[PDB]
Structure formats: structure tokens, C-alpha cells
Amino acid sequence: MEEQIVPFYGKHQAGITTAHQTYVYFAALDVTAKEKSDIITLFRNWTSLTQMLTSGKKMSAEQRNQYLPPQDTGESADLSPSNLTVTFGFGPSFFEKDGKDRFGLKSKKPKHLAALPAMPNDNLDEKQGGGDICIQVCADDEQVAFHALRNLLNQAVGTCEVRFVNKGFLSGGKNGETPRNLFGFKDGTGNQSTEDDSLMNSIVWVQSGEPDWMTGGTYMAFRKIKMFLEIWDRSSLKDQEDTFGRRKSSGAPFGQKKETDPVKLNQIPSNSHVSLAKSTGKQILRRAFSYTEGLDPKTGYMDAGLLFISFQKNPDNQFIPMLKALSAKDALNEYTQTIGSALYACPGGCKKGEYIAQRLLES
């Protein structure tokens, strides 16, 4: 190809319809500062630095003063940009924490930004969820990704405490096949094409009915979903395919030849994952990554799962009904448990000369 540089500036924030990279670092933060003007400072600086990290500009580093810290941590000096994207979102608690509109922003609050409803089978750790700000960092190289997060978080010392940092991977096939999750199934097929503007306009991107700063933005849902690999791996192929209602290998819906053939609902169990998701009639854009965090001390097996991230213009319409219908009855519940949860509103894109969330934080 050419180079791996994804624009930072644009109508939309990168990292959403951007072709899905291999690695993610996913972080949520709380603001401890009390003035809005501290926040403007954080967003201005986050903006300058994201532009620089994603563009491929390297900091010269001829430090005028040996006695100060280097402005960059340096572990990416010799690395390509690797399609780095950084996407920012704001949780409900940014607009109103514990009854208080801390920053005078409750009137610019997005139409559908609220914590997700409790669902059956949830086993949420509150500290593994929520947050005032999320940063989603993606790249084709784990070290490029970590470097961007670390340097971004360094800038937030004084203003924000870091709540959690997750990270994940998902490898696409050598010839561009749909990437497989840890259950060994193709994961993404049902997404519409990220290159179809019409469909992305109708499924993902905010155009009306929200505060101006959300124009060209979207909502991001996050669910941290542990996957029980040892249970799954001991299951028959029949149980695996029936759980989803596609064939493992081909990815095709039952009774069909190809991955991309329409789902025949009447040929798949009612409570198969695909049946339940498709049957709400609604669409989202899933952009998830697998994770592993070593051994689970409470299990003695691998701690592994899915960092479920989806984008949608109206989560009340598009997402929560899906969540409701799967949480009750999904065959997949046999093999998974949700342990983290958040919904964030992601601002529209940054224009050159403005900063992220400006039309929110100003005037």
C-alpha cells in the first residue's frame, strides 16, 4: 500500500468507520478538576498531541534542557503510525455527577446519554465501567497504541484520574477475511459496509435532534464480556454452531452457502445469538476486540473475552432493545458474562484549528 496514516481532522472522529485495526487500548477517566477552563485546556492539548501522534510527525527531541523530562516517552520513535486512531467520548457523569451539573453543561447534554439499564445475567464491576471520558486508541501495532494512550494520559495528570485501562486484539484474515473472535467465529459479517455512506449515515452518524457539538458524532456502547474458553472448547461443534446460527468455518447462516448470504430466520434456533439480534429489526456498528488478562484467580483458567464496542446514532432505538432481547434468552449466555458497561457520546469531528468538543465546552 502507501503509508498507514489515518486523518485525525474531519467531519467525523476517526476510529469508527475506519477499517478495523489489530490492537486497542480502551481507557475511561474521571475529571477531578472543578473549572470548565481546565477541561478546555485538556482538550486543546489532547487535540494537538493526537494530531501529531496520528500524522507521523516525530518530535525532533533535541531537548534544549537536559534537566527537564523528555516531552515524549520515546518508545515509538522508530515505528510507523500503523493507522493509529484516537476516539473520544463523554459519559453521562461528565454532564451531571451525583445531582450536580459540575461544569455548566447539562443544557448541552445529548438526547440519549444515560447509563445502560441493568440486565439479567449482568455481573458488573462498577469500577470497570462508566467514566466521564473514554479514550479508544487503535493501531496495527500494540506498542504504537500503548505509546499514544500513555502520552495522552500523561497530559491528564492534574485534571483526571484514570478509572480503567483495557486492551484487545483482533486479527483479520491474511486475504482480508472477516476477523475471528476467540470462539473461532467470524465477527462482523452482519455489519453494513463502513464504505457505504448512506448506511453509515442512517446507522451511525448524528445529523439532527441533538446539540450541535454532536453533529457528525455518534454514541459508543461498551460491554466487557468475559468468554469462558474452557467451557466453550469442551462443547460439541453442534452446540457451538447452534449457539450462533452460523456455521463456524464458512460463517454462512444455517442452510446457506456463503458468509454474506441472507439469514433465513426459520432455519436457526429461536434463541441463537444471530436470531435474537437480527429479530429486533435494528442495526448497529460493532467494532469489538478480544482480550486476555492472564489466569483468572477465581477459576485457574485464562481470563479472556470480548471488548464489545458498538456505534449507533440513537442507542435507545438501535442498541438497548438488542441488549434487552439477548440478555434474557441468548444461547451465548451459557458461555459469557458481562462484567463492565458504559455508554458514551462521541463528539463530531474536529476541524483544523479547533479542538475536540469545542462547540460543547465554549460559549
Ligand X SMILES: COc1ccc(CO)cc1OC
Q: Residue 233: CB partners within 8 Å, gap ≥ 6?
A: none
DSSP helix/strand/coil, 200: helix
Residue with smaller CB distance to ligand HEM, 27 or 263: 263
Residue 286 contacts ligand X per CB under 6 A: yes
DSSP state of 279: H
Q: How far is the CB of 18 from ligand HEM (least distance, A)?
A: 18
Q: Find which of ligand X, ligand HEM, Cl ion, none residue 179 binds, CB within 5 to 8 Å per kind.
A: ligand X
Q: How far is the CB of 55 from ligand HEM (least distance, A)?
A: 28
Residue 308 contacts ligand HEM per CB under 6 A: yes
- Residue 283 C-alpha cell reads as 442495526
Rounded Cα distance between 268 and 271, Å, is: 8
- Nearest of 82, 65, 74 to residue 22 by alpha carbon: 82
- Residue 234 C-alpha cell reads as 469442551
Stretch that binds ligand X, among 106-114, 140-148, 152-160, 187-195 (CB under 6 A): 187-195
Residue 145 contacts ligand HEM per CB under 6 A: no
Task: Please identify which residue in the block is written with the cell numbers 472522529.
Answer: 13
Could you tell me if 314 and 141 are in contact, meaning their C-beta atoms sit under 8 angstroms apart?
Answer: no
Number of residues counted as binding a copy of itself (CB under 8 A):
66
Residue 63 contacts a copy of itself per CB under 8 A: yes
Q: Per CB under 6 A, which of residues 85..144 are in contact with ligand HEM?
A: none
What are 28's strand-pairing partners? 134, 164
Rounded Cα distance between 129 and 30, Å, is: 11
- Residue 85 C-alpha cell reads as 486512531
Residue 68 contacts a copy of itself per CB under 8 A: yes
Could you tell me if 8 and 14 are in contact, meaning their C-beta atoms sit under 8 angstroms apart?
Answer: yes
Q: How far is the CB of 271 from Cl ion (least distance, A)?
A: 3
Rounded Cα distance between 168 and 227, Å, is: 13
Among 72, 132, 141, 187, binds ligand X (CB under 6 A): 187
Q: Find which of Cl ion, ligand X, ligand HEM, none residue 86 binds, CB within 5 to 8 Å per kind.
A: none
DSSP state of 235: S
Q: How far is the CB of 288 from Cl ion (least distance, A)?
A: 7
Among 20, 246, 247, 287, binds ligand HEM (CB under 6 A): 246
Q: Find which of ligand X, ligand HEM, a copy of itself, none residue 20 binds, CB within 5 to 8 Å per kind.
A: ligand X
Residue 298 contacts a copy of itself per CB under 8 A: no
Instruction: Determine how many CB atoms are found less than 10 A away from the CB of residue 32.
Output: 12
Q: What is the largest CA-CA distance in the chain?
A: 71
First to last CA, the chain: 44
Residue 186 contacts ligand HEM per CB under 6 A: yes
Rounded Cα distance between 67 and 87, Å, is: 34
Q: How far is the CB of 175 from ligand HEM (least distance, A)?
A: 18
Q: Find which of ligand X, a copy of itself, Cl ion, none residue 194 binds, CB within 5 to 8 Å per kind.
A: ligand X
User: DSSP string spanning 126-159?
Assistant: GGGS--SEEEEEEESSHHHHHHHHHHHHHTTTTT
Among 288, 326, 332, 356, binds ligand X (CB under 6 A): 288
Give the interface with ligand HEM as residue ranges (CB under 6 A). 181, 183, 185-190, 223, 225, 227, 244, 246, 263, 273-274, 277-278, 284, 286, 306, 308, 322-323, 326, 332, 336
Give the interface with a copy of itself as residue ranges (CB under 8 A). 22-23, 61-63, 66-70, 72-80, 141-144, 146, 150, 153-154, 161-162, 164-167, 169-175, 177, 180-185, 229, 233-238, 240-241, 248-249, 290, 292-295, 300-302
